[PDB]
Structure formats: C-alpha cells, structure tokens
Scaffold this active site. Structure first.
Site, mmCIF file in Angstrom:
data_model
loop_
_atom_site.group_PDB
_atom_site.id
_atom_site.type_symbol
_atom_site.label_atom_id
_atom_site.label_comp_id
_atom_site.label_asym_id
_atom_site.label_seq_id
_atom_site.Cartn_x
_atom_site.Cartn_y
_atom_site.Cartn_z
ATOM 1 C CG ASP B 157 -0.358 -28.298 -11.334
ATOM 2 O OD1 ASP B 157 -1.330 -28.217 -10.575
ATOM 3 O OD2 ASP B 157 0.150 -27.305 -11.902
ATOM 4 C CE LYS B 159 -3.496 -26.071 -12.032
ATOM 5 N NZ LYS B 159 -4.045 -25.701 -13.365
ATOM 6 C CE1 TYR B 225 4.822 -24.766 -18.173
ATOM 7 C CE2 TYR B 225 7.018 -25.348 -18.940
ATOM 8 C CZ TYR B 225 5.889 -25.648 -18.205
ATOM 9 O OH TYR B 225 5.815 -26.825 -17.510
ATOM 10 C CG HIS B 229 4.975 -28.417 -20.196
ATOM 11 N ND1 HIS B 229 3.850 -28.102 -19.454
ATOM 12 C CD2 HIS B 229 5.194 -27.423 -21.088
ATOM 13 C CE1 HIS B 229 3.376 -26.992 -19.982
ATOM 14 N NE2 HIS B 229 4.162 -26.529 -20.948
#
Ligand SMILES: *S(=O)(=O)c1ccc(COc2cccc3nc(N)nc(N)c23)cc1
Lengths: 287, 288
Positions: B157, B159, B225, B229
């Site tokens: 990810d 972050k 979204y 995932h």
C-alpha cells in the site's frame, strides 16, 4: 483515600505504552499490580482553559509552534487500577509478548482448548460479586433479573464515565456456565436477544446514545470465561474491537438462527501471546 | 512562554481520540487550531510517587480490584500543545473527522437500495486498471498470478514506507473485472480467493520473511473502491479498518462460501457510514 496496602517497591514494568499513555507496574507491598492511565480530554474544561491565561513553555516554533502545558487539578486526572493481592495469572497477562494468530477448528477446541481451559484460567469472583450485588450495586445501569435469560449492564472498569467518547459498558449474564462463544447454542438465543435489545435501550435511556452509535460485540478467547457482551462507542477504537477477536452480537444471533451447530463446528480465528502454552498445544496438534 | 494570538473561541472539535488521549480544536482568534495531547508516563517519577502518599479518590472496589482518581504533582501533569496559526480550510479539511453511524444491510437492502445508489454515481477505477495492465506502479509489484480469472497483483500500500515490518501493509487486486465487493462473491470465486490467501502469504514469506500467523488478511465491507481487493497487514499493527464493523477475514469468507453458497447475497452485513452520507439516509428510510 489510602491505597489498599502500605508502601510500594517496583519490581518490573509489565507494560509501558507511549501511544495509549498507560503503564502496568508490578510491586511488592505481598504482591500488587498498579495501572496508571492518562484520562481523555473533556471538551468543556479544555475550552474553558484556553479562553483564559494558561501556563505554557515553548518547545519549538515555525506556523507550527509546540508548548509544554501545566493545567490545574481538574485536567490532571489519572485512572488508577490496583490489583491486590495479584496472582501469577495477573503478572503474566499484562506483560508484552509478540502475538501469533491461530485458527481453531471445532475438533481443536474439543480436544485441545477445552481441556486446557478446564485445567483452569482465572477467579471469576468479581463477576459473581456484581451478579449477587455484593459489589458495584450503585453502578448497575440496567438489570434483567431472569436467572436464565437475564443480565446486568454495568459500565466497565476501563471507562472513567466522564465522557461518552470512550463509552464502554458490559452486559454480564446471570446464567452460570456459558464460558465463551463456543458454548452458545439456539437455547441461548432469548438471552442474547435480551442483551442486544435491552442493553441498547438501557444505554439510550441512561446516556442518550442511539444504537447506531454503538458497537456491540463478544470476544473470542475472552479474558474471563463467563459470557459477557461489550457495548462500545463507535468512534472509540476500543482495544479488542479488531476482527481477530470481536464478534458482533447481531451476527452471532443470526448465525445461530441459520446454523444451530455453528459455534461448535466452525473454525474460529484469534491471536495468542508467543509465550502462551495453549498456542504451542494448538500448533503441535495442527502439524 | 505564552500564545501566538489573543483569546480563543472554540467553534468546532475537529478530531478526538480517547485511546490516544488527544484532541483537535478549531477556534477563532484575535482562525487557529490547538492540539492537546496527554504526555506518556515516566517509570521513575511514577515509581517514586507510589512509594509515598498520593492523593487518591476511590471510584469503586470489587474483590482484589479497586479503581481510583489520582491527582499527581506538576512534574507528571505535562500536556503537549501544538498551535497552528493562521489556519486555512484545507487544514480544517485534513484534520476534521466525520461522525459515523452503523447500519445493518440485508440482502434485499443491498439489491434495492445500495446497488442502485452505487450504479447512480459513476465511479472510475481507471487507476486499478492501470496497475493491472502494468501502465502504472509496475516497479512495486511484489507478486503476480497472471491468470485472467483466478489471478491477482500484490502491491505494498502507498502509505507503507517499506522501511520496517512493524507496519507491513500490502494489497492484492484481482485480475478479474466485475467483482465490486464482498456482495458479488459466490463459490465460482473460491479458486481466486484461495490463491490470494495462499499465494499472497507465500509471497510475503519469501519477500519479507514474515510467517502467515503474523498476518491479518481481510476485505472491507463497504470498500473505498468497487474492484475486489484484499488487505495483508502485520498483526501487531492496530490501525482502524482492521475493526470488526468493516474487516472480514479471507479465510472466514472462503469457509462461508464453502458452507453457504448464497451467503453474501442473502446475509445481513454490518458497516459504518459517515452521518452526511446520502446512502445512510436511503437505508434508514427504507428500513422504517
Ligand atoms: S486490569 O487491572 O487491567 C483488569 C483486571 C481484571 C479485569 C476484569 O474486570 C473487572 C474486575 C473487577 C471489577 C470489574 N467491574 C466492572 N464493572 N467491569 C470490569 N471489567 C471489572 C479488568 C481489568
């Protein structure tokens, strides 16, 4: 008020979290464990302080300026939990160890977990004391006295009751013998429905907090083996609200209505401390 | 030594964290933001205080357990004060958290209310497609099963700074198009899900030398979204999203589809929504 003992001799700092502003200290008094926690901010008394002249000492500057603030007595509250006399179960529990996740099948519980549990865990005496009103009577938010389907909704020891931000109450059932999620069958549906509904309606009356502001759950691998339901403010990232432990009551109820044999057959997922003997027992059983 | 302005008028409490013992306050001065944080304990000063006579006030006592209210001297009473002056709306936007309300969506609620609302707001997942067809973030692919149906792409990810395993946080995006969320999952998706769980974990073990029992592998219900995932996070990393009101463990998701094929189409899912969310009102109105 004086401590339950005389004098403290720190032995070991069991746990020291800088993120949660908490400390767990083991000390000789006889054995005693003292937990100190910095209390969350109370909007009113802070807003009132900033409108006046506070005692500040600048650390650094920029638009970003940092200070060291020394507020008066009111804001200086510290949550003090004292465990005296504290057993070896207490001293091992509060200690920080790395966690490992384990997936316990229905057979793993029957053959490995249940016999380990029966070998013994903790005294539940404080639970009994609440239930038979020998302690904390003055704090009962709501009680359904029914011996089977009944409960006692009391604020948890972990909530200072000074703000709704960290609202945390427990529904402890009157019926003895329901150790955990694993003991639940459709016969427990009226009890669980009572907790869900009557527990939320009690919070709405007492704290004016609507049910959609509440996260109502159970813990798999609970800290004590006498069924208890957590009622926590949604905005509160309550340690234990995480998926690897929390099970929503509404969902527990629904699964039971769908699959009667669910919690006896299905694989439950939880974390265990690396030093936990139960972790090894399950690991060995699985290879 | 003092304050960068004169007078404070609290208008709005931007953020609160009762666990972190922190508060974010927007106030009008002479626009400014004041952050107050309770300082961590100092083992030494605390041990020194308990050896003597502290000012305690009992909340209650039950068996060996007893709670108090402690008022320590100045040396323990430090509060971290960050002042942002002057303040603008984008800062007020990055520092303000929305009030959340919980909702319990039945199968019919999703079909009649959630799905038509979703379809109404034409949301682009082009950035997802860009990853999948390697037009973007190719350099970040940890692992890829290229199978068009049962395949996926494992990427850290954004972050996660990748400098430590303590906050390990990777996301697997499936190659197959059309799986919006948990609600679209059926037993036909079991081979894909099994690959994500087992292959994803094997890749993490090879790449990061992190055993599977150190990993929390989950899906979010009401994802940000709508292209399936799965999250792979370090277990010691407790940061919202891993909370029960949103996270669904892949292993459990797989097991449910093995038991009840029609599970995620029929069963009631519980999640939180921001108070200002139009979907929250739509569900509320539909339910009464
Ligand atoms: S610890 O000191 O953090 C600690 C130890 C045991 C427990 C179990 O909880 C309680 C013990 C005794 C009384 C009590 N009363 C209420 N209202 N709620 C709880 N949770 C407990 C907690 C913490």
């Amino acid at each position: 008020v004086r401590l339950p003992f005389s004098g403290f001799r720190l032995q070991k700092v069991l746990r020291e979290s800088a993120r949660d502003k908490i400390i767990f200290l083991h000390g000789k008094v006889e054995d005693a464990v003292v937990i100190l926690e910095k209390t969350p901010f109370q909007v009113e008394q802070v807003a009132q302080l900033l409108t006046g002249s506070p005692e500040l000492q600048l650390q650094f500057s920029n638009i970003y300026s940092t200070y060291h603030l020394f507020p008066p007595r009111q804001l200086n509250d510290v949550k003090t939990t004292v465990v005296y006399p504290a057993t070896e179960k207490h001293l091992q529990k509060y200690l920080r160890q790395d966690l490992r996740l384990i997936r316990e099948t229905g057979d793993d519980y029957r053959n490995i977990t249940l016999p380990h549990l029966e070998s013994q865990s903790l005294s539940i005496q404080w639970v009994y004391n609440i239930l038979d009103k020998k302690a904390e009577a003055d704090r009962i938010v709501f009680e359904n006295p029914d011996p089977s389907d009944g409960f006692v909704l009391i604020p948890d020891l972990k909530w200072n009751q000074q703000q709704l931000d960290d609202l945390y109450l427990i529904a402890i059932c009157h019926r003895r013998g329901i150790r955990s999620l694993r003991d639940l069958t459709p016969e427990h549906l009226p009890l669980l429905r009572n907790i869900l509904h009557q527990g939320q309606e009690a919070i709405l009356q007492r704290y004016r907090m609507k049910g959609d502001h509440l996260r109502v759950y159970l813990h798999y691998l609970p800290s004590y083996y006498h069924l208890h339901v957590h009622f926590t403010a949604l905005g509160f990232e309550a340690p234990g609200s995480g998926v690897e432990r929390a099970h929503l009551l509404a969902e527990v109820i629904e699964n039971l209505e769908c699959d009667p044999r669910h919690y006896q057959q299905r694989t439950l997922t939880f974390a265990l401390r690396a030093d936990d003997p139960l972790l090894k027992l399950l690991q060995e059983a699985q290879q």
